[PDB]
């Protein structure tokens, strides 16, 4: 038969590639060699809308002369001063090692390992809760509801990501959806396998209905994982 959209996405054709040239650049922390054992103050210069980020961004000029792009937290002020280091005050916009953040605080942009650049909790309107502080690990509750252990030296920023609440407003218009997904080159509109042809999808056929159960095994090979993949349960609980 023919290929699936998910299979074709793996080949990186322009139909499926991210247009990573309209954006404002990558958002990563200053190299760990600058942050460790030394605290720097930076001034917020501008706050901008990144075409594909789901959150606003901001430019920071540091005392040492480095210009960086960061994910602006809610309430950040242009011209505000922020601190990055171990000896920075606990406030919104400052980046601290996880071992120096009191329990019960909201943080964002958490490094998976010390110095990677930040990987967790970067979408707009998200935050993570610092639960416990131990010499070997710091427990943090993530937006998905999972308690993950981080190395104490991982860097994170205090506050919440600006731009939360988007999903409150419906898109209403197919044209609104068109522009939204075109901004990121995400496949839209989307077809239905049941109304595809048998050559194209496992569920295809003249009679619009799957001929097999829709829960597919986790051991299925590529080109077969459609529908509910390795679903423990289905339906309304």
């Amino acid at each position: 038969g023919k290929s699936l959209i998910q299979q074709r996405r793996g080949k990186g054709s322009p139909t499926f590639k991210s247009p990573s040239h309209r954006f404002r650049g990558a958002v990563k922390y200053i190299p760990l060699n600058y942050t460790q054992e030394k605290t720097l103050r930076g001034v917020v210069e501008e706050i901008m809308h990144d075409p594909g980020r789901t959150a606003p961004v901001a430019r920071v000029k540091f005392e040492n002369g480095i210009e960086k792009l960061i994910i602006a937290p809610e309430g950040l002020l242009v011209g505000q001063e922020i601190y990055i280091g171990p000896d920075a005050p606990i406030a919104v916009g400052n980046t601290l090692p996880l071992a120096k953040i009191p329990e019960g605080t909201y943080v964002y942009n958490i490094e998976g390992i010390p110095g990677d650049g930040g990987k967790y909790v970067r979408a707009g309107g998200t935050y993570a809760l610092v639960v416990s502080r131990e010499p070997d690990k710091v427990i943090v509750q993530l937006p998905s509801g999972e308690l993950k252990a981080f190395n104490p030296m991982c860097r994170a920023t205090i506050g919440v990501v600006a731009g939360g609440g988007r999903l409150e407003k419906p898109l209403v218009k197919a044209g609104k959806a068109y522009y939204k997904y075109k901004a990121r080159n995400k496949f839209w509109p989307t077809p239905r396998g049941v109304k595809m042809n048998a050559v194209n999808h496992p569920f295809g056929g003249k009679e619009h209905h799957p001929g097999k159960p829709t829960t597919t095994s986790r051991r299925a090979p590529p080109g077969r994982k459609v529908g509910h993949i390795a679903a423990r349960r289905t339906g309304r609980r």
Binding site: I47, P73, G125, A162, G164, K169
Partner: peptide, 11 residues
């Protein structure tokens, strides 16, 4: 100028 919620200044 500051950063706030998508539809409200404060969330």
């Amino acid at each position: 100028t500051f950063a706030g919620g998508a539809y409200l200044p404060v969330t």
